[model samples]
Target: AQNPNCNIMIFHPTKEEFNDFDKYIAYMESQGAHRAGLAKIIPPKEWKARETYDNISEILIATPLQQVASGRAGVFTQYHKKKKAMTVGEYRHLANSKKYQTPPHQNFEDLERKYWKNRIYNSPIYGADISGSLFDENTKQWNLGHLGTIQDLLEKECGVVIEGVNTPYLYFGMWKTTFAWHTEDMDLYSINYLHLGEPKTWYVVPPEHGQRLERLARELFPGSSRGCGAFLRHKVALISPTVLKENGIPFNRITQEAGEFMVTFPYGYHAGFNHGFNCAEAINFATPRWIDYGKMASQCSCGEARVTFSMDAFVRILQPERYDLWKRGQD
Candidate 1:
């Protein structure tokens, strides 16, 4: 099955290559680094953007998955209590079959007007596609297997973090299907890859301003400030980018295209919507910088229902490994 000349393949990169990799990582953390940098790295050639679009399109055209109008939770089933569901086929037909046929916010407003009239809904048709390569079963365990994925490298090698707490979920959406403003658990980072789509417009507020924004939201929704969980639930008031900027809060606007990646830093409040019908894979991971935040999750309404990794449990699992690495001068 292998070519004779390609018989000898290197399982790991050379030391020099690893050093260069570290340089790139350092660059990403540097101040000069661009906002939500885009890259072309992808799966196998067969898994092309066009190809993924076809696969997801076929499913959307054929089946009617659960569609939620709200945007507080990750999974539709988890938060769409008693919410009505609709088929993707119906959404497409109603939202125009053309790709990227509408503008950004205006299109979103159009979708709201067309589908959810006389309602306080955010975006109407959000397709949470759980059945995909995006969901890893190994994520449930803190296994250090040689064979793994980019996720494994982030969790196992970068930091001894558990995965179930940061579950990976695939998404499919059309015009105006927005993910409302929010951040990851314990103010962690998240990686989103647009496998195939027109483009997703993103607005990200930095961490420093995140707390201020939350405080403002809490003040606005004083009734929801009873508990941290209630804060997220009742403080779901949608704020515009202009409003945020007017209030001296800086933010970055990125239009993520197909084959591009969107990385949201710790505590970064970001919200965006699909330009047209699109499919994306997203996952969360924590670095050493996230350790302290993980400790304060309970008081902050950090982890959602899907997050299964406890802070104390993760620390216990990581302590021995951290000690061993320090002993080997690999810290």
Candidate 2:
């Protein structure tokens, strides 16, 4: 397997189009882009924000994913060892240092030896959900606080505030730092913007073949799927697309550079690794239609083991409290 791959659809929108959420969704629907599982949007050059490095010192937790070997090495077993809570300044230094590298191996024997002897770990700071503590609004477009889609679907409707679910979270990555195969919370549409960084390489599986990917995942990680199906959401499982393609499943690879937007459709099933030191922000969002998938998944569900939200319940709560449209509400 020379590692088979496919290309995802890319959308280029003007500054005006990018700022208008309605027009953005219209273009997505018009192109049937949802079926592709993932779409890459290249915003106008003006959209690029000046790169700013934070000055203060803060302790951030980072997950350790093995760069080699089978155990905790991007499979069903265990992807994360004990996490490291490192200083922000120290993290930047190590993450930027050229000492971290994972060599190419052809077979598991070599991988095993490398794991045991030449062990390397890529500590990725993922899903940190710092919007509650940081972010100035103008820098990141993944912000869902003022947008209609989030306002109507999750916030005003659900009345809940979650850092990574409805609000934007930050991802700090270095070479080979990976996000395991998984979908967004409740399988809602997800938008990711590389705030500042090098390129990020992504692998995606189409929604039609979602079940195929899931079936294979369960086969490999039987422990994860013993009684639950949404096991990948654990963010602990990882697999190569070459395995998927070798088994007749469809998969695509896409590269996301800085100043670009990448979105994942509901149940898209995607995984990726950063090229080098980079920062990205992501959050889950929904549309009126997403309620269907929400229902199907629950009537059929992030740490969200608890069924914390239901559209049916939300509607019931909203109906009695409403009078009309426009500028209504409040006694």
Candidate 3:
């Protein structure tokens, strides 16, 4: 399983995705802080949320393995403050009411229970430079909104373009830990960045006999593939190898991934998951252009058999300087 784009990639994070404990707390809050029990995996960052997300920059810059600064710009926590746990019903109400109403591409009233049980649009606690949605118990509806503008956040925190977001991109929300099956819009020119601890897995399947691959994936996982387009082009990989891939689960494919592996996936399908772990990350990007809606509408046939379809665009290339593994002129 190849990752879609990696002009420059650095593995063996110079910094842990998490640091002290309070930072972990913030991560939990940002991720809805839903888990509870003796068996829960306590996140190191949560116990260290107060520790600055400054290291997050290290994680970003280190990937492609660049020499980064200790005092770099921020990658703001998704939340301004730790959020108190609230019921999905409670969240749904605030989301649908006028007190928190705001929209263009979102509507609370138009949503169903599945919506709130999922994302809480622009969550008050963890909403950062991303978008979100959830059922509003108070108003009994679902709503969606942007957390913060990626551009401003990048300039203020990262002091650079938001990588994959600098170009055209694709993004959509489905059930928890799932997404629509479409690649960086239609041209297939894009970058996908995820911010969080451990997520399910991010896949990149080459577009060759892609239909067959998608079919196999769906047959095994059912609707779990979301819009992955039924594929078995290769295998599933994980972001953190030591923690996520070490268990000898299905994540062994991560071993195939080399430094900043570039995947011109004309013959592949990609996807991932946390499988009820404490890892929750965001997978969204902004491309300069929007994709054609007709492609989305035409992606699949009109029937239950049509598991996936393309929808109006949502959409990366990576930096070239830091890659040590691949020869520059080899292409």
Model 2 scores a TM of 0.73
Candidate 1 vs candidate 2: which has greater lDDT? 2
The TM-score of candidate 3 is 0.27
RMSD of each: 11.9, 8.4, 19.7
How big is the positional error of residue 331 in model 3, measured in Å on the Cα after superposition? Answer: 44
**Model number with the top lDDT:** 2
Model 2 lDDT per residue over 91-170, tens place: 56767666653355665345334432322243443324445323355755434444554545655556654332245566
lDDT per residue (tens digit) for residues 64-100 in model 3 = 1111111101111111233444333343343345543
- Full candidate order by TM-score, most accurate first: 2, 1, 3
Clashes of 1: 0
Q: Which portions of model 3 miss their true places by more than 4 Å?
A: 1-194, 215-252, 255-267, 275-298, 301-331
Better of 2 and 3 by lDDT: 2
Better of 1 and 3 by TM-score: 1
Query: Which 10-residue window in model 1 sums to the lowest lDDT?
Result: 2-11
